[PDB]
Design a protein around this ligand. Structure first.
Ligand SMILES: Cc1cc2nc3c(=O)[nH]c(=O)nc-3n(C[C@H](O)[C@H](O)[C@H](O)COP(=O)(O)OP(=O)(O)OC[C@H]3O[C@@H](n4cnc5c(N)ncnc54)[C@H](O)[C@@H]3O)c2cc1C
Ligand SMILES: Cc1cc2nc3c(=O)[nH]c(=O)nc-3n(C[C@H](O)[C@H](O)[C@H](O)COP(=O)(O)OP(=O)(O)OC[C@H]3O[C@@H](n4cnc5c(N)ncnc54)[C@H](O)[C@@H]3O)c2cc1C
Ligand SMILES: NC(=O)c1ccc[n+]([C@@H]2O[C@H](COP(=O)([O-])OP(=O)(O)OC[C@H]3O[C@@H](n4cnc5c(N)ncnc54)[C@H](O)[C@@H]3O)[C@@H](O)[C@H]2O)c1
Ligand code: SF4
Ligand code: SF4
Ligand code: FES
Lengths: 468, 276
């Protein structure tokens, strides 16, 4: 009906479908001011309750409308290390803007809170700079950070500011995590990631790139030569369904496809030396953000037909709703309640087809809230020359075993205190997907914040969870 | 200053037409390297990640050996690199180390460049006190040469050229000509997938089991994507984490051969490069 969000510049679907430039272009200042005036400044501010780290949302929006952008950035920065990221990638539809009261008005949309966080962060990022430092020579203790994702970057940043020696160890050649090899450029521009890394680098943090912990440097070395250790290795194995035809040429994990496309930039081939297989008709299994970004990455390679194949319905799709629509706008087709059975290959080796069925709801909760059961005679085949499986990911099973006394959870993730981040091993902390499983950037950020604070508290002698 | 830098190419030596041998300065990688392991490298910023084996290490001086065959762009560019040049990315040591004990009489079989991979295993087996019989095959004779100074110094060597010293042709024929003498329960195959397939197909044997060093397509090399996917026995293994060395009997050879040809369009980046 009435109060909807303020429109922002976006790439046209037909033009952006073949290139990797960012789709959401970002608010102009006047647009940000227009959106900011929509905030009712609720004294009870339920919006804050919708935020995983409970950012002072009406505060930074208010300082924005008051033309005080400097204070707005600092308000955000007190709560969130990576606001230029979360403004872009947060599923605001199920978090903060899901709790905005103006959305509770009759047929009205919530204040674009994610967009305003994005604006303030970007406005102060693209042009404005901060300061110099390092202050990380103040304290005596050395800390080893494993992984340069949202968690490791945040933890390292906070510990450096606190004065401790911080060594980040990264396996790949570019920092870090999902922000470089996971999420594509048309969602999260890498300039932002490189910027934050340089910012953390300017804080005095030492980056050990091309270093696989447990291999390049052994676990028991990290434990010997450091005062504290943060395990922020995230989770990506990945997981293969294991159905027949999995070993066929043209079948991909979303990990390999995206690592090639995002980190190795196979779409700029042959400028970049990393190749990728042709895909005129491609099927991506799953409806998560991983599946959605993969399919969207595939279409930009010259794909004629791109299909989403999902076991459940639309409403159950975990992907970011804006990005779901974006995928639709690019021409990607969605198949709900469909489960692949096998992959059919040719004599020369190549995926030509895929056997599938349809699904329905029967049992309550066998496994997963609406556990789906296949339907007989719904069995059909789909003609695809490329297949990307995005059904999930897992923790690093061998690496965790090299940590003596480290206790795992239900199925492989680290047992770690939610607030302190302290594990069963003295001085060792952890956070992000390596603890919670698949989750959000903002939560990985927050875990990095909390762990860093209690590493500080621990290294000062104040607090010690390891007694016996 | 005036000295050695990270990932510096310390010594480069051209030992065959399209085969090049490198000694690279990497203290960490050289110190932490176990026999059977490998590294993944990237030459330039636009470059790609490719896996290459550690052929030897000198931790005290922090160097590691690698021998490369030129089959395409990246190996070519690495060969054109000169002494003093640096490789942009070097990650390792990756893969699972060889299983090294004091078994008995051991047979080793290797092809051209795979011999380099087969070398630190030999040394390690001889480091554990094994009595070795080594078989050396190559692309040619001294036009494309195989390293004699490695094996003959390390063990008793039978040379299996494609028409020169020792028997003439495929190395499986040299394993075949054990017959009268032979040995007790180990054989190793490192080379192109076809040769490793056949040395496995030695199945007649004397009832000797084969260790094989697989060479699938790799991206990260850390077990994060599954490009190096291999079916061992009936089950799926990752040769970068679970391998690269497996038991040849359990290795699915036809599917690996099929997967090594998965990208054949890669010849394009060789052509644009070969113009220059
Ligand atoms: C395709 C994809 C899309 C996503 N989209 C969204 C979204 O839209 N909105 C949202 O809120 N969340 C999203 N997420 C989730 C979010 O990215 C993660 O929850 C968050 O990044 C977790 O941070 P992390 O540090 O725990 O893991 P990671 O970001 O994966 O950090 C792992 C880092 O540590 C390195 N590392 C791992 N093991 C080692 C080791 N042994 N030695 C050295 N280095 C190591 C890795 O190379 C990597 O650089 C997405 C995730 C994926 C995979
Ligand atoms: C553990 C492991 C250790 C290895 N050690 C050595 C070694 O010591 N010396 C050596 O010469 N080779 C070695 N290889 C094989 C080597 O990785 C490939 O020859 C390499 O990928 C060649 O790629 P490129 O230089 O041509 O560049 P790319 O552009 O990446 O390769 C494309 C071209 O190279 C051809 N090619 C041949 N093999 C491969 C391959 N595995 N992957 C992709 N393309 C391939 C392709 O047909 C194509 O023409 C090893 C492989 C593994 C898995
Ligand atoms: N698997 C590994 O660990 C590893 C390590 C390095 C190189 N390689 C491989 O080396 C290969 C290139 O080989 P090359 O150029 O040195 O020479 P090549 O292809 O001619 O093989 C060298 C020798 O292998 C022996 N051989 C026996 N049967 C064979 C057969 N049926 N087919 C081929 N060879 C047979 C022969 O003696 C031949 O001389 C590459 O494809 C590279 O992948 C593998
Ligand atoms: S709820 Fe919507 S309106 Fe009320 S404060 Fe948070 S943002 Fe401003
Ligand atoms: S962090 Fe994610 S959730 Fe918390 S505010 Fe910024 S956007 Fe809304
Ligand atoms: S190289 Fe990607 S998982 Fe082994």
């Amino acid at each position: 009906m009435k109060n909807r969000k303020t429109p922002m510049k976006e790439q046209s679907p037909e033009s952006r479908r073949r290139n990797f430039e960012e789709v959401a272009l970002g608010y102009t200042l006047e647009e940000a001011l227009e959106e900011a005036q929509r905030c009712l400044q609720c004294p009870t501010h339920p919006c804050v309750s919708g935020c995983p780290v409970e950012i002072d949302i009406p505060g930074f929006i208010r300082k924005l409308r008051d033309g005080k952008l400097e204070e707005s950035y600092r308000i955000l920065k007190s709560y969130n290390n990576l606001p230029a990221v979360c403004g872009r990638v947060c599923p605001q539809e199920v978090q903060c803007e899901s709790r905005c009261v103006v959305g509770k008005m009759k047929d009205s949309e919530p204040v674009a809170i994610g967009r305003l966080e994005r604006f303030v962060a970007d406005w102060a990022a693209e042009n404005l700079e901060e300061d110099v430092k390092p202050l990380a020579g103040s304290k005596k203790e050395k800390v080893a950070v494993v992984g340069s994702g949202p968690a490791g970057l945040t933890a390292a940043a906070d510990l450096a500011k606190m004065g401790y020696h911080v060594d980040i160890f990264e396996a790949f050649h570019k920092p870090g995590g999902v922000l470089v090899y996971g999420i594509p450029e048309f969602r999260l521009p890498k300039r932002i990631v490189e910027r934050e890394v340089s910012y953390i680098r300017k804080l005095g943090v030492n980056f050990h790139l091309n270093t696989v912990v447990g291999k390049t440097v052994k676990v028991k070395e990290l434990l010997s030569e450091y005062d504290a250790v943060f395990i922020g290795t995230g989770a990506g194995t990945p997981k293969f369904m294991g159905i027949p035809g999995t070993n066929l040429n043209g079948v991909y994990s979303a990990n390999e496809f995206l690592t090639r496309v995002n980190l190795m930039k196979a779409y700029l081939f042959p400028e970049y030396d990393t190749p990728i297989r042709v895909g005129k008709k491609v099927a991506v299994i799953g409806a998560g953000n991983t599946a959605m970004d993969a399919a969207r990455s595939a279409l930009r390679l010259g794909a004629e037909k791109v299909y989403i194949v999902y076991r459940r319905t639309e409403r159950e799709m975990p992907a970011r709703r804006e990005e779901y629509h974006h995928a639709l706008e690019e021409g990607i087709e969605f198949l709900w309640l469909t489960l692949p059975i096998r992959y059919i290959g040719d004599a020369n080796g190549n995926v030509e087809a895929m056997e599938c069925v349809r699904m329905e709801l029967k049992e309550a909760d066998g496994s997963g809230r609406p556990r789906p059961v296949p339907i007989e005679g719904s069995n059909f085949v789909l003609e695809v020359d490329m297949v990307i499986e995005a059904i999930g990911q897992g923790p690093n099973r061998v690496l965790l075993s090299e940590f003596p006394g480290l206790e795992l959870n239900e199925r492989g993730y680290i047992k770690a205190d939610e607030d302190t981040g302290a594990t069963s091993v003295k001085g060792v902390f952890a956070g992000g997907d390596i603890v919670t499983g698949a989750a959000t950037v903002i939560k990985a950020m927050g875990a990095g914040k909390k762990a860093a604070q209690f590493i500080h508290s621990y290294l000062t002698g104040e607090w010690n969870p390891w007694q016996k | 200053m005036g000295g050695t830098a990270l990932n510096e190419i310390v010594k480069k030596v051209k030992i065959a037409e399209d085969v090049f041998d490198f000694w690279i300065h990497s203290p960490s990688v050289s110190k932490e390297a176990r026999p059977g392991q490998f590294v993944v490298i990237r030459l330039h910023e636009k470059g790609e990640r490719i896996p290459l084996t550690v052929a030897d290490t000198k931790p005290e001086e922090g160097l590691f050996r690698m021998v490369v065959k030129v089959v395409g762009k990246t190996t070519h560019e690495l060969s054109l690199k000169k002494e003093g040049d640096t490789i942009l990315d070097v990650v390792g040591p990756l893969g699972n180390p060889s299983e090294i004990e004091n078994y008995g009489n051991v047979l080793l079989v290797g092809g051209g460049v795979g011999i380099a991979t087969l070398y630190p295993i030999a040394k390690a087996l001889k480091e554990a006190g094994n009595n070795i019989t080594t078989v050396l095959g190559a692309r040619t004779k001294d036009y494309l040469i195989m390293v004699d100074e490695f094996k003959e110094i390390s063990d008793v060597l039978l040379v299996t050229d494609d028409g020169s010293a020792g028997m003439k042709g495929v190395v499986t024929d040299a394993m075949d000509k054990l017959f009268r003498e032979r040995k007790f329960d180990i054989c190793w195959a490192v080379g192109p997938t076809i040769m490793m397939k056949f040395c496995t197909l030695k199945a007649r044997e004397f009832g000797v089991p084969i260790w094989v060093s697989l060479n699938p397509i790799m991206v990260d090399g850390t077990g994060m994507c599954g490009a190096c996917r291999v079916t061992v026995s009936g089950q799926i293994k990752f040769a970068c984490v679970d391998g690269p060395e497996f038991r040849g009997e359990e290795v699915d050879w036809d599917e690996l051969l099929k997967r090594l040809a998965q990208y054949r369009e890669q010849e394009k980046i060789s052509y644009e490069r070969f113009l220059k």
